[PDB]
Amino acid sequence: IVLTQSLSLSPGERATLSCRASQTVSSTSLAWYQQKPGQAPRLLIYGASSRATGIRFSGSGSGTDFTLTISRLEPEDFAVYYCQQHDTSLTFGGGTKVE
Amino acid sequence: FKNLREFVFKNIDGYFKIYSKHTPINLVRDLPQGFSALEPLVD
Amino acid sequence: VQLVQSGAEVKKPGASVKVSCKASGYPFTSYGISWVRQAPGQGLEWMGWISTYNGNTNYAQKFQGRVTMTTDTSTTTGYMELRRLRSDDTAVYYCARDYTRGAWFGESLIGGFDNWGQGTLVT
Amino acid sequence: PDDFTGCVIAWNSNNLDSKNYNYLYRKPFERDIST
Ligand SMILES: *[C@@H]1O[C@H](CO[C@@H]2O[C@@H](C)[C@@H](O)[C@@H](O)[C@@H]2O)[C@@H](O[C@@H]2O[C@H](CO)[C@@H](O[C@@H]3O[C@H](CO[C@H]4O[C@H](CO)[C@@H](O)[C@H](O)[C@@H]4O)[C@@H](O)[C@H](O[C@H]4O[C@H](CO)[C@@H](O)[C@H](O)[C@@H]4O)[C@@H]3O)[C@H](O)[C@H]2NC(C)=O)[C@H](O)[C@H]1NC(C)=O
Ligand SMILES: *[C@@H]1O[C@H](CO)[C@@H](O)[C@H](O)[C@H]1NC(C)=O
Structure with a gap:
């Protein structure tokens, strides 16, 4: 399965990030990651909407259309976010940069 | 016959319990007369 | 919990590399090791x-027949051997603790x- | 079993499984899947 991802916003603004799947997903096998420049990615959301331990961040969606939102951007949110699907093998989207 | 192998097969509450015993024999007719007890190996 | 890997290496095409990963702060048996590649700009x-419990390993089709993964539970480590390297393989290879697949089942x-x-x- | 020893643990999965008609239904621990 192939994931396609689709951000210029100031700190304090609400951000919406999204990914589309070529095929439907079990939903519970959707995860989102955050990768700061110079650092390894970390898990933010798993199970479509559940928040990972240690993580304003929230996930949701169904079928082939899912999102990740940040209620208010911080200077530390200016990272590349990734959409991961792992119900049938494993795949990631290209990634979305937030500035 | 030179070797005797005995088994117990029972199916209880979804479990298939297997007991067995191995012992040498010297008899070309049927099962030798005698006594031994079989022990559980597989469940 | 912390994962640590080996330093950078430079290889010529046709060469092999063994990338090590060590971890601590948790029981090793219950979590698998996921290898994720990220080429610059990608x-x-x-x-x-790979399962640290039974050795079962799943691979992405792109690397099948090229990469062999193994584990050693006595040192709390895992290794990824990449054979017949190409210039196309210039990338950062990440080791991550993996809970998307059961280590035992x-x-x-x-x-x-x-x-x-x-x-x-x-x- | 009537003399069952163990623990039964359960939780709501409305936000995990529901959409979904892929869950089918009709001795102790007998699993009969004949159709
Ligand atoms: C099913 O998976 C659930 C999620 O698992 C996590 O996320 C996945 C994606 C992987 O990364 C996995 O490795 C993660 O563990 C799992 O839920 C988790 O259960 C553990 C307990 O085993 C929880 O750890 C404890 O957290 C509390 C603090 O919780 C508060 O703060 C967090 C901040 O993120 C909030 O999200 C919570 O809602 C709370 O507000 C700690 O205080 C606690 O430490 C104390 O207890 C431990 C012993 O357990 C002692 O050693 C310490 O010294 C302390 O006394 C733990 O750290 C974890 O928070 C929880 N995560 C989530 C998101 O719910 C679930 O248990 C799994 N089910 C089964 C059957 O395994
Ligand atoms: C096993 O099959 C027989 C028919 O040969 C049936 O009468 C019996 O009830 C079945 N037992 C169970 C536990 O389904």
């Missing part, structure tokens, strides 16, 4: 997943890759 690619789980190492750069 996104994340799943390479494979091999079934899909509701989770993700939580604790990542720093990434080993191989040219």
Whole structure:
């Protein structure tokens, strides 16, 4: 399965990030990651909407259309976010940069 | 016959319990007369 | 919990590289090791997943026949051997703790890759 | 079993499984999947 991802916003603004799947997903096998420049990615959301331990961040969606939102951007949110699907093998989207 | 192998097969509450015993024999007719007890190996 | 990997290496095409990963802060047996590749300017690619319990390994089609993964539970480590390297393989190779698949049963789980190492750069 | 020893643990999965008609239904621990 192939994931396609689709951000210029100031700190304090609400951000919406999204990914589309070529095929439907079990939903519970959707995860989102955050990768700061110079650092390894970390898990933010798993199970479509559940928040990972240690993580304003929230996930949701169904079928082939899912999102990740940040209620208010911080200077530390200016990272590349990734959409991961792992119900049938494993795949990631290209990634979305937030500035 | 030179070797005797005995088994117990029972199916209880979804479990298939297997007991067995191995012992040498010297008899070309049927099962030798005698006594031994079989022990559980597989469940 | 912390994952640590080896430093960077430079290889010529046709050469092999052995990328090591060590981890601590948790029982090793219950979590698998996921290898994820990221070429400069690119996104994340799943390479494979290995069970630290029984040795079962799943691989992404792109690396099948090229990469062999193994584990050693006595040192709390895992290794990824990449054979017949190409210039196309210049990338950072990340080791991550993996809870998207069961270490004991091999079934899909509701989770993700939580604790990542720093990434080993191989040219 | 009537003399069952163990623990039964359960939780709501409305936000995990529901959409979903892929869950089918009709001795102790007998699993009869004949159709
Ligand atoms: C099913 O998976 C659930 C999620 O698992 C996590 O996420 C996945 C993607 C992987 O990364 C996996 O490795 C993660 O663990 C799992 O839920 C988790 O259960 C553990 C307990 O085993 C929880 O750890 C404890 O957290 C509390 C603090 O919780 C508060 O703060 C967090 C901040 O993120 C909030 O999200 C919570 O809602 C709370 O507000 C700690 O205080 C606690 O430490 C104390 O207890 C431990 C022993 O357990 C002692 O050693 C310490 O010294 C302390 O006394 C733990 O750290 C974890 O928070 C929880 N995560 C979530 C998101 O719910 C679930 O248990 C799994 N089910 C089964 C059957 O395994
Ligand atoms: C096993 O099959 C027989 C028919 O040969 C049936 O009468 C019996 O009820 C079945 N037992 C169980 C536990 O389904």
